[PDB]
Amino acid sequence: MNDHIHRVPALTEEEIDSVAIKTFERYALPSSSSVKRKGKGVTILWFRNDLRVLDNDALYKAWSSSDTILPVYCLDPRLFHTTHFFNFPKTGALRGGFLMECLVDLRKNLMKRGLNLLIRSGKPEEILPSLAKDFGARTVFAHKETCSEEVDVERLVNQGLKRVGNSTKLELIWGSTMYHKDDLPFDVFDLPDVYTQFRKSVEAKCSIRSSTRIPLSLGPTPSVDDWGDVPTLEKLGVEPQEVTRGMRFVGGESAGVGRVFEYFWKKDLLKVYKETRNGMLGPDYSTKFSPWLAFGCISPRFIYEEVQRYEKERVANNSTYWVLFELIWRDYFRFLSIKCGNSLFHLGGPRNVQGKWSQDQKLFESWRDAKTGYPLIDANMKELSTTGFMSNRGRQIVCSFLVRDMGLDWRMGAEWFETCLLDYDPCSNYGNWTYGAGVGNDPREDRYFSIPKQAQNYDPEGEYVAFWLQQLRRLPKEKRHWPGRLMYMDTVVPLKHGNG
Amino acid sequence: DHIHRVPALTEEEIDSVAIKTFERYALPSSSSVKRKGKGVTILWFRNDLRVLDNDALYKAWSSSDTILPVYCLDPRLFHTTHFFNFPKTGALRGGFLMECLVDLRKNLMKRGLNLLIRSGKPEEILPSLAKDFGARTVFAHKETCSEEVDVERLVNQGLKRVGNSTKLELIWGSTMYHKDDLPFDVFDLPDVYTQFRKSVEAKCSIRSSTRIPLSLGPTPSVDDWGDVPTLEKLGVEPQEVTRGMRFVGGESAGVGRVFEYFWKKDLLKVYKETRNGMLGPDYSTKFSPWLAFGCISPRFIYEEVQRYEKERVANNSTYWVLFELIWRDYFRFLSIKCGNSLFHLGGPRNVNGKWSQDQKLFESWRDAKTGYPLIDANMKELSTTGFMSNRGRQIVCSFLVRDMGLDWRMGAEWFETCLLDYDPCSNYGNWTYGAGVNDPRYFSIPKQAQNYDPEGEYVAFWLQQLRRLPKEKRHWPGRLMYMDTVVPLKH
DNA sequence: TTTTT
DNA sequence: TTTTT
Numbered sequence A: 001m002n003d004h005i006h007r008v009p010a011l012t013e014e015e016i017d018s019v020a021i022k023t024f025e026r027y028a029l030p031s032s033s034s035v036k037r038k039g040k041g042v043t044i045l046w047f048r049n050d051l052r053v054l055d056n057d058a059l060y061k062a063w064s065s066s067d068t069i070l071p072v073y074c075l076d077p078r079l080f081h082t083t084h085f086f087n088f089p090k091t092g093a094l095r096g097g098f099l100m101e102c103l104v105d106l107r108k109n110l111m112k113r114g115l116n117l118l119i120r121s122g123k124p125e126e127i128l129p130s131l132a133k134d135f136g137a138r139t140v141f142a143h144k145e146t147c148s149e150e151v152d153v154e155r156l157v158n159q160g161l162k163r164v165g166n167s168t169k170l171e172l173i174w175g176s177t178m179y180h181k182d183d184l185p186f187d188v189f190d191l192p193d194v195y196t197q198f199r200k201s202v203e204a205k206c207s208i209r210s211s212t213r214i215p216l217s218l219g220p221t222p223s224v225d226d227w228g229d230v231p232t233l234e235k236l237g238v239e240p241q242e243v244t245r246g247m248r249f250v251g252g253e254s255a256g257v258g259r260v261f262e263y264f265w266k267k268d269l270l271k272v273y274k275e276t277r278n279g280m281l282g283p284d285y286s287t288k289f290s291p292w293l294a295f296g297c298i299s300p301r302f303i304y305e306e307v308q309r310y311e312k313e314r315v316a317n318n319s320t321y322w323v324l325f326e327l328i329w330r331d332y333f334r335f336l337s338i339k340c341g342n343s344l345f346h347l348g349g350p351r352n353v354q355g356k357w358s359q360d361q362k363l364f365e366s367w368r369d370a371k372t373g374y375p376l377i378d379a380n381m382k383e384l385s386t387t388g389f390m391s392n393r394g395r396q397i398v399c400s401f402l403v404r405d406m407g408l409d410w411r412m413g414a415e416w417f418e419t420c421l422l423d424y425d426p427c428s429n430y431g432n433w434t435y436g437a438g439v440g441n442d443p444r445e446d447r448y449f450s451i452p453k454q455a456q457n458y459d460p461e462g463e464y465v466a467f468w469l470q471q472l473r474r475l476p477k478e479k480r481h482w483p484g485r486l487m488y489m490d491t492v493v494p495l496k497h498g499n500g
Numbered sequence B: 001d002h003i004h005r006v007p008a009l010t011e012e013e014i015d016s017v018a019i020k021t022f023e024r025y026a027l028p029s030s031s032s033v034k035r036k037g038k039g040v041t042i043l044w045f046r047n048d049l050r051v052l053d054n055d056a057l058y059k060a061w062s063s064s065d066t067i068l069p070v071y072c073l074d075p076r077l078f079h080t081t082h083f084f085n086f087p088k089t090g091a092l093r094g095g096f097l098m099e100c101l102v103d104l105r106k107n108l109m110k111r112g113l114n115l116l117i118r119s120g121k122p123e124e125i126l127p128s129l130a131k132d133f134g135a136r137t138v139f140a141h142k143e144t145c146s147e148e149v150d151v152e153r154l155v156n157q158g159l160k161r162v163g164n165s166t167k168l169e170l171i172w173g174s175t176m177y178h179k180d181d182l183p184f185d186v187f188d189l190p191d192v193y194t195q196f197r198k199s200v201e202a203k204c205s206i207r208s209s210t211r212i213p214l215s216l217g218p219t220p221s222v223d224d225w226g227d228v229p230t231l232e233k234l235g236v237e238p239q240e241v242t243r244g245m246r247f248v249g250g251e252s253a254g255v256g257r258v259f260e261y262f263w264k265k266d267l268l269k270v271y272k273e274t275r276n277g278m279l280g281p282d283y284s285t286k287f288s289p290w291l292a293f294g295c296i297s298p299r300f301i302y303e304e305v306q307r308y309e310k311e312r313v314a315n316n317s318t319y320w321v322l323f324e325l326i327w328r329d330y331f332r333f334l335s336i337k338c339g340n341s342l343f344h345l346g347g348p349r350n351v352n353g354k355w356s357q358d359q360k361l362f363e364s365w366r367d368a369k370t371g372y373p374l375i376d377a378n379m380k381e382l383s384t385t386g387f388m389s390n391r392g393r394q395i396v397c398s399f400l401v402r403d404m405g406l407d408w409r410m411g412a413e414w415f416e417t418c419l420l421d422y423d424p425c426s427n428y429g430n431w432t433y434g435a436g437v438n439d440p441r442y443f444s445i446p447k448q449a450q451n452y453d454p455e456g457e458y459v460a461f462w463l464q465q466l467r468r469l470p471k472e473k474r475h476w477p478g479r480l481m482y483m484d485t486v487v488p489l490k491h
Numbered sequence C, D: 001t002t003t004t005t
């Protein structure tokens, strides 16, 4: 396989810059004298989880409705407080570091287009109105978000701008999804409660829009005395962390488009994606696009166009389709977050299921700290805390284990994923947790995963567990799955099914 | 005949009062706001059938040099109810709607505009008009519930299909407190009304009503402004009010009733004392039918309350009218938070109980043959007038759910057919609340009869056979004097 | 019913 | 906890 730490993408920094230039050139708006800018005044572009220049409608609209743009990112102190119910760190060190890399790359890429990124630490509803006043901005453009916390910030910013006068308007633009909200065959209040019904409808009745093309010249900015430093984690009360084993994701749009190139074109792996996507070990088994999608470093419309080109130039098969099937799951949970609102975060979930659930700290800590006694579980939980990533197969398994085998309040698992995952997204995280916990609005199915069966089918040689739990390396297949207590450790709970 | 027009003003008195109200609130001139070169716009009316305090109308006017107002008679409005298939719009509300449209056209014409009336789906009508007239924009008020928001989607996509350029602009209205001014996003709306009320009263201001110029013209050149469709064309047999309150449709009549209730009769200052009554126009504002169609707005009502508090009296009753309008806002915002759970058997909380849909039981409730005078008189008033007292609505809801054990949506859908003031937010909001399937309650029929109809005058008015009887037997008559009871009382 | 003893 | 045995 290779026992080195695996950079994602694995491209050299010079390969990344070359691919980035070619990609930006391929999708560039071939000049635009037709767009009228003169006399349109100053605008502020407020970045959140859309840290890219490519295929960015908020940026396009800001540019087309102004003569001067002030791009701004606010490091919101609330991002580094604690989680809602159980008070874990709101943002763990690994995602914190990924965010900083995203910001460094965004500033660099904006500079290539005649702009810069203003960085400030503080609450957007305090920073943005002050900037709008100082620079005389007519508008603040930003992407629309869906969940409670984010929409509350939108309200506070809008009310803040109002409080300094009329004129300055907050303009929120839909983004994030492969299928556009406005193009759906239903309002989101009537979103089907079954995914298959949603997928069939959009596939039959909708089209995917082309990527928005962005000009190579986006300047000028206003005259700014201090563009601000990239913040450091220590200032935010977070101890920096470096990956010591496994995958080391690299933040930013440049690296993100680099990974699309790497996975699709250089390694030619898209043609077998459906075959390998239930793997757990290494970068090759799946796209690994999720951290870049969560921060908006890349966009699904861009990915879809790359898939289209791959299908023309190389091959179209069930694997080239399945990547889109999975991006449609991302769309679904995004839209479902609007339909469900805060019931997405409640114990009973969307259908308000009753009864039970332990919050035993000792049990939870054994799951969190990879000390359950089941190698399959512990390896996954160790991968998570070490790298900020876990395989899709692993996420499903550790969810079932915590809910069903341990009997724990599922929100303890969801909030720990919120702390740890580079790709943390409230819609996808709480969506999949409620789905896996059996508290979604989807019809009743008892989705119990057998740990022994999962180990045999998806880690048949014990390669995955041996990688993360190196004391198991010397053992053959069967002991890797079931090592026994002295070699490994005690089991904290019995298994509900598939032998105790 | 014992028929009471609401308001009790002649058509000419209504005109006089409306003129004075329009002039009081008129925007004094406005050459300042420039219009020239701004092109054609379409104003799409739905349940906002007024000129006063209309932000959709003002924005359409300020962003254009020419305005085409349109109302579409949507055929889906005259199909059937969702679960139990009663008429989607009953004859009495249908008649009220047509009167509102005639008045709106009149009031728009007096401002140099007109009203284009077409029968059909907005998503088919509006894009065609946009294209033919070269409209840059279609302005309309934003709605909150599934059916209305689906029409918004279909119109938007229909405009995209003719081309880019033509944009649908949806404006928040309807409420006393503005959505954008709330101290929380609607996803975090308090599940208890009292917390909502205390929050908005402490942290929000009520905006001044939007003032409208007296001259709004011109319109485009239009060949046929369209006739008002008859109820018979739409598959509804006309119905007249044969007894009780006869509400008069339109903004003019609505502003007339505000004048009548507040100023002519001076009743606002006792509103809280009288509001649990059931007989006659005097006991409450009776604003609801005009509010439901948007013939009047709560910001205008608040401005009239302020003036009354200055020119007449301020006390607990003058406040209480605002308290109740805040309930209207709450259910509107709750419709967004709850979505379609507002219409489901289990409600927002998804309660799992057991509920009969027995057709025989439901019909004795519907047709005022329960054998309980208080219940039957209220149900008769509803079917005869399209209105029922607030006190009555609470009682008949309690009776249907708890004494008869019926699926509450049967009663909610019957209200949807009959009520002049039908509003999905307020109706299904109040039914879920009353049925105990709300976000956060039994009525004793005998107690209610004694406390809110002591002399039996209400039941006697609607139930002719009780009129001869003394109050003792008006409360509890019996089989021979009235009829048998279809179910016993739970308590 | 995406992925599930 | 609008009105509530």
Ligand SMILES: Cc1cc2nc3c(=O)[nH]c(=O)nc-3n(C[C@H](O)[C@H](O)[C@H](O)COP(=O)(O)OP(=O)(O)OC[C@H]3O[C@@H](n4cnc5c(N)ncnc54)[C@H](O)[C@@H]3O)c2cc1C
Pocket: A277, A286, A287, A288, A289, A290, A291, A293, A294, A323, A326, A327, A329, A330, A333, A390, A391, A392, A393, A395, A396, A399, A417, A421, A423, A424, A425, A426, A428, A429, A430, A432, A433, A436
């Ligand atoms: C308990 C649990 C929690 C999860 N939390 C998150 C989360 O916080 N953020 C997140 O992005 N995904 C989450 N997922 C979904 C999924 O596991 C990850 O998106 C996936 O593992 C990322 O790896 P990849 O990019 O190589 O995925 P691929 O298999 O290559 O899929 C391609 C893309 O499709 C999307 N996708 C794939 N599967 C899902 C899915 N199950 N739900 C939604 N989108 C999907 C992602 O954008 C992903 O990048 C969660 C799943 C579970 C079971």
Ligand SMILES: Cc1cc2nc3c(=O)[nH]c(=O)nc-3n(C[C@H](O)[C@H](O)[C@H](O)COP(=O)(O)OP(=O)(O)OC[C@H]3O[C@@H](n4cnc5c(N)ncnc54)[C@H](O)[C@@H]3O)c2cc1C
Pocket: B275, B284, B285, B286, B287, B288, B289, B291, B292, B321, B324, B325, B327, B328, B331, B388, B389, B390, B391, B393, B394, B397, B415, B419, B421, B422, B423, B424, B426, B427, B428, B430, B431, B434
């Ligand atoms: C089962 C049930 C169903 C209802 N259905 C509707 C409906 O479809 N449409 C509707 O407008 N009202 C509905 N209501 C609320 C209320 O009964 C009526 O608004 C009221 O009777 C109208 O009479 P009024 O204008 O004279 O009220 P007033 O006592 O004079 O109150 C003034 C205004 O405040 C508002 N208001 C008062 N009470 C309520 C309330 N409980 N909920 C919301 N707003 C209120 C109304 O806009 C009303 O016009 C319902 C109540 C119940 C119990």
Ligand SMILES: Nc1nc(=O)c2c([nH]1)NC[C@@H]1CN(c3ccc(C(=O)N[C@@H](CCC(=O)O)C(=O)O)cc3)CN21
Pocket: A084, A147, A148, A149, A150, A342, A345, A346, A418, A426, B187, B188, B189, B190, B191
């Ligand atoms: N990025 C992100 N955005 C979020 O909105 C979010 C997360 N992450 N992670 C988990 C938290 C928890 N979420 C919650 C959980 C509960 C309520 C809630 O119950 N609110 C009440 C109203 C206010 C109150 O009384 O607390 C409700 O009735 O909905 C809201 C948001 C928001 N969640």
Ligand SMILES: Nc1nc(=O)c2c([nH]1)NC[C@@H]1CN(c3ccc(C(=O)N[C@@H](CCC(=O)O)C(=O)O)cc3)CN21
Pocket: A189, A190, A191, A192, A193, B082, B145, B146, B147, B148, B340, B343, B344, B416, B424
């Ligand atoms: N004016 C008005 N507007 C409405 O939206 C409305 C009324 N009146 N009167 C009652 C009906 C019933 N309402 C309903 C009831 C159920 C769903 C519903 O359950 N929809 C599904 C998705 C579509 C489906 O599967 O049927 C859902 O999951 O929410 C929607 C609207 C809309 N209601």
Ligand SMILES: [Cl-]
Pocket: A055, A056, A057, A058, A174, A175, A176
């Ligand atoms: Cl976008």
Ligand SMILES: [Cl-]
Pocket: B053, B054, B055, B056, B172, B173, B174
């Ligand atoms: Cl308005």
Ligand SMILES: [Cl-]
Pocket: B004, B244, B245, B279, B280, B281
């Ligand atoms: Cl009467």
